């Protein structure tokens, strides 16, 4: 629907500017001239700027000749120090070309956005090639991951090829008939979930970005991917359920919960996600529920939080020492979020925290340790270590209680 | 028969498969052409609004296309209240695309339902959103409603003044926003305020595209509101003699 | 009243619901022109869900009341139905298989007319209505009215054999039921012509839909051996 | 509180009098600002920690309540702090639509 609603008249000012500026007979700007402007030894951003700015005025029908030069040279736009307006206008022109010339534009655009270290890199990514394996479009040069216009382009491509692949393999299984439908549905669900996971991993800050600065290209790409995932979840919430059952790196949970308004449906299946055997899935469920409770503080959210507290208290006395550490290290920062969402949980949260603190203290007492936290019973506050698991878990319990008390007190 | 054809087309709408649904939706205007019976038109548009509320985005856009095409028939709607109420419910959707489609729907329906305050507030709210698709839809709907309504016109005039004066708005959105002012001809004082705004615009935004758009909008406003035509002609002659740009001169000629 | 009964007959709460439906649908119309009538009717329908259901049942009962009123109210029902009247069809099935013992003859004829209209229009869920109406035919009986009803529904099914074709299970249900009717019916020249029509239709279905007739079961052979 | 409850009952009985009742609540808020704001969180039904569902705009009784609250809040500066985000949104809606009733 994005391409169709793009065609919709907004105000008609574009027609006015068409009739006014294009009448200058500056239409001497030709694809060969644009290609020459791109291939200057210096960057020479002025000439390409003027040409593509002029091309914005061109109607979609006559803009077809410029498809080859714009797509072929968009790899050069990844270089450092390219002006933003160049990429913005390229995005606008690509959207226009997509509105009138979708399929071959997609084929040539994917062929153009190859990593380029492999040079040709199998330029035979035909229409069928992408239609069978939509994830090819994600196999692109790393620089697009922090280039918001071309990233938006790639997201459009990815959505289109997911739907195209669905219809394609449906048609293929129909014609090859001469059960398999279950395998079709499973393959489609797996493909959509895999696309979602790759996008989420793109949203992660890399090590260099890890090496504050909340306004950058990464935030723009995160917003774009969040919008696309919102569209996908609206299209099929079962994909959201499958992705969350698969889980993903918990650093994204604030980002994903804040940027995907359809995420509120997660409270429906979180009770069933909790009941999975895998410890990792339960940990992820607790973290997800904590972020949602921060976001949406609803009675159903409170009931699911009560269930979360009860299961954490339950399997506190089912897990071994190593399992206790591995489970309660990530899910303890969720308790402060639960306290923030729901004051009526203070009783159960504090009772659970006391029980786990005494269990961990006894566990510390069983074996000789380095720090011996029990004798350090009168320590002060310490805001922000390869020690043994139990003292780490005790310090984590301490920090959880510190955060809860500090936020409630102020 | 009219009703027979109507329900035989309706069973396609209920088919579930998207192809038959959009087929029926775009089949609707032909049925209006065959049977300009206000009973049938009212019932058909109610069904359209129901499927618009419950259907996905593509089906909503199809219903938008149908509403735009079936402009001549929609003044014969009996239950305008229920129709617009169930249409308006989609505006609360978190999906920005659905909100944009609903804003465009309201803009198409502006002829039969002006002076509807909740619709006006929805237009005003979306105008300051973040999703560019929703903002453009809000601009289109604002154009239509300001063409129809009067109080909405002065409210949007004030909002556009404080928005263009603001720095958050990008240049392209400012270009899209200016021709809204061509509908401020509902009364003399509103037109004069719009004239002051356009004077401010041409003074403080001297680049080619927006002086083009702004002085063309001023020309249309002066044409509609005959009170300010002499000063508009004087301003056009001033821009013709003084401004050096060829494009601005050619627009002055036109 | 509508359903034949006497003083001793129990006050049927379903029939009282139908009477309340009569009250709301008629008193709201007030004999005004259809335009404002359907305007107000749509307003009342869109007010809420139970009143929507009440209006739908009132339209359904009016379809069983009088011919001209049946035409106008079926028009209005097709114009004002929101969900396509699927739960309305469910209530039609319930009223049908429950109250057919007491249904008046004119109401029977008008209900048959409504069934034909629904089948011709291809409204969704009509297969359920067809197979539950089919179920009410009593085997091993020779009452004139029942045989007339069987012939009428047979005529409906024959003219809309394509609608049977797109309804896979209904093919098997119809062919089995008509074979049972064939082994039941004999004796008169009119019944002989009816027999000819039924056997022609059944042979055509069996040849054209042999694969679909596979799931009927061994009792198909049991019907075959008698004919 | 009794005045408001009986006025809402009157709204249910005789909705055509909605404009006059809104005028009533306008004058009630303006002439009794301090006495209203202790009753604000009950009137808006705001929960201590939950986020209440957005009330149905264009409803008669809710508009009546909002008119009373806003006209109470014209003089009092502590009143708007108890408003949720949708209450501000509805304030903007009412202010543009019913400027003669709802003050700044």
């Amino acid at each position: 629907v994005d391409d169709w609603i793009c065609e919709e008249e907004i105000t008609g000012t574009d027609a006015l500017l068409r009739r006014m500026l294009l009448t200058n007979n500056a239409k001497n700007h030709s694809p060969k001239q644009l290609q020459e402007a791109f291939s200057a030894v210096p960057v020479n951003n002025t000439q390409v700027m003027q040409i593509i700015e002029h091309l914005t005025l061109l109607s979609a029908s006559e803009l077809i000749p410029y498809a080859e030069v714009l797509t072929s040279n968009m790899s050069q736009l990844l270089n450092s120090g390219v002006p933003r307006r160049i990429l913005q206008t390229v995005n606008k022109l690509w959207m226009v070309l997509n509105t009138v010339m979708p399929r071959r534009l997609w084929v040539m655009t994917v062929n153009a956005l190859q990593p380029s270290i492999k040079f040709v890199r199998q330029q035979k990514y035909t229409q069928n090639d992408l239609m069978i394996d939509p994830l090819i479009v994600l196999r692109c040069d790393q620089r697009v991951h922090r280039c918001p216009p071309l990233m938006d382009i790639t997201l459009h491509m990815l959505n289109g090829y997911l739907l195209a692949s669905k219809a394609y393999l449906s048609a293929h299984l129909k014609e090859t008939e001469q059960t398999r439908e279950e395998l079709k549905n499973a393959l489609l669900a797996a493909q959509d979930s895999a696309a979602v996971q790759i996008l989420l991993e793109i949203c992660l800050p890399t090590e260099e970005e890890k090496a504050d600065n909340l306004l950058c290209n990464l935030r723009e790409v995160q917003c774009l991917i969040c919008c696309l995932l919102h569209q996908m979840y609206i299209a099929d919430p079962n994909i959201a359920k499958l992705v969350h059952f698969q889980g993903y790196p918990c650093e994204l949970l604030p980002l994903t919960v804040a940027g995907i308004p359809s995420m509120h449906i997660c409270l429906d299946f979180i009770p069933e996600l909790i009941a999975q055997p895998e410890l990792e899935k339960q940990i992820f469920a607790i973290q997800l529920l904590s972020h949602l409770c921060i976001q949406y503080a609803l009675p159903k959210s409170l009931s699911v939080a009560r269930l979360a507290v009860n299961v954490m208290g339950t399997l506190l006395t089912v897990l071994t020492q190593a399992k206790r550490y591995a489970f309660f290290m990530p899910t303890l920062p969720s308790l402060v979020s639960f306290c923030r969402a729901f004051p009526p949980l203070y009783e159960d949260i504090m009772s659970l925290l006391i029980q786990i603190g005494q269990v961990c203290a006894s566990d510390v007492a069983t074996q000789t340790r380095d720090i011996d936290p029990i004798i350090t019973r009168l320590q002060q506050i310490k805001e922000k270590g390869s020690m043994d698991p139990d003292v780490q878990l005790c310090h984590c319990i301490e920090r959880t209680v510190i955060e809860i008390i500090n936020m409630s007190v102020s | 028969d009219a009703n027979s054809a109507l329900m035989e087309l309706d069973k396609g709408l209920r088919s579930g498969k998207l192809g038959e649904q959009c087929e029926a939706v775009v089949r609707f205007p032909r049925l209006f052409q065959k049977y300009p019976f206000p009973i049938l038109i009212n019932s058909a548009f109610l069904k359209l609004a129901d499927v618009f509320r419950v259907g996905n985005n593509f089906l909503r856009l199809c219903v938008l296309k149908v509403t735009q095409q079936s402009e001549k028939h929609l003044e014969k709607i009996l239950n305008v209240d229920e129709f617009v109420k169930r249409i308006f419910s989609v505006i609360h959707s978190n999906d920005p695309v659905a909100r944009a489609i609903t804003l465009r729907m309201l803009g198409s329906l502006a002829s039969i339902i002006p002076e509807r305050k909740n619709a006006h507030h929805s237009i005003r709210q979306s105008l300051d959103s973040h999703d560019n698709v929703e903002v453009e839809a809000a601009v289109f709907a604002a154009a239509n409603f300001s063409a129809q309504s009067k109080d909405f016109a002065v409210g949007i005039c004030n909002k556009i003044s404080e928005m263009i004066q603001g720095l958050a708005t990008p240049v392209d959105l400012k270009l899209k926003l200016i021709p809204i002012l061509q509908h401020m001809h509902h009364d003399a004082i509103l037109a004069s305020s719009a004239r002051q705004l356009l004077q401010q615009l041409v003074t403080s935004y001297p680049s080619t595209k927006m002086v083009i758009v702004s002085l063309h909008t001023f020309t249309l406003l002066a044409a509609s509101s005959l009170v300010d035509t002499p000063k508009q002609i004087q301003l056009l002659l001033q821009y013709l003699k003084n401004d050096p740009r060829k494009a601005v001169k050619r627009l002055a000629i036109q | 009243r509508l359903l034949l009964s006497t003083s001793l007959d129990a006050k049927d709460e379903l029939e009282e619901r139908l009477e309340r439906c009569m009250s709301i649908v008629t008193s709201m119309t007030a004999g005004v022109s259809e335009r404002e009538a359907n305007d107000a009717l749509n307003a009342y329908v869109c007010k809420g869900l139970p009143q929507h259901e009440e209006i739908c049942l009132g339209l359904f009962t009016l379809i069983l009341t009088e011919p001209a009123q049946a035409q106008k109210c079926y028009r209005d029902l097709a114009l004002v139905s929101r969900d396509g009247m699927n739960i309305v069809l469910n209530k039609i099935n319930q009223i049908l298989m429950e109250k057919y013992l007491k249904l008046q003859d004119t109401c029977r004829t008008q209900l048959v007319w409504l069934v034909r209209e629904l089948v011709k229009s291809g409204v969704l869920g009509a297969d359920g209505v067809c197979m539950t109406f089919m179920k009410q035919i009593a085997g091993g009986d020779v009452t004139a009215k029942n045989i007339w009803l069987a012939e009428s529904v047979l005529d409906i099914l024959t003219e809309q054999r394509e609608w049977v074709l797109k309804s896979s299970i209904l093919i098997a249900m119809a062919v089995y039921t008509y074979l049972r009717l064939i082994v039941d019916h004999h004796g008169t020249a009119q019944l002989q012509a009816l027999r000819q029509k039924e056997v022609d239709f059944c042979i055509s279905l069996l040849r054209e839909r042999f694969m679909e007739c596979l799931m009927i079961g061994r009792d198909l052979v049991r019907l075959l051996q008698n004919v | 509180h009794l005045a408001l409850v009986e006025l809402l009952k009157n709204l249910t009985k005789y909705p055509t009098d909605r404009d006059s009742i809104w005028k009533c609540l306008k004058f009630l808020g303006s002439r009794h600002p301090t006495l209203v704001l202790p009753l604000v969180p009950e009137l808006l039904s705001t929960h201590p920690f939950f986020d209440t569902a957005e009330p149905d705009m264009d409803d008669p009784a809710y508009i009546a309540v909002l008119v009373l609250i806003f006209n109470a809040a014209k003089t009092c500066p502590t009143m708007p702090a108890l408003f949720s985000d949708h209450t501000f949104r509805h304030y903007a809606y009412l202010r543009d639509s019913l400027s003669h009733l709802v003050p700044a």
């Binding site: 449906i265 949406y296 | 959707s93 | 809420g48 | 569902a53």
Partner: peptide
């Protein structure tokens, strides 16, 4: 109902 936030108005028919 993923297209509507839980704290949005409910369209009661």
């Amino acid at each position: 109902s993923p297209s509507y936030s839980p704290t949005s108005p409910s369209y009661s028919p």
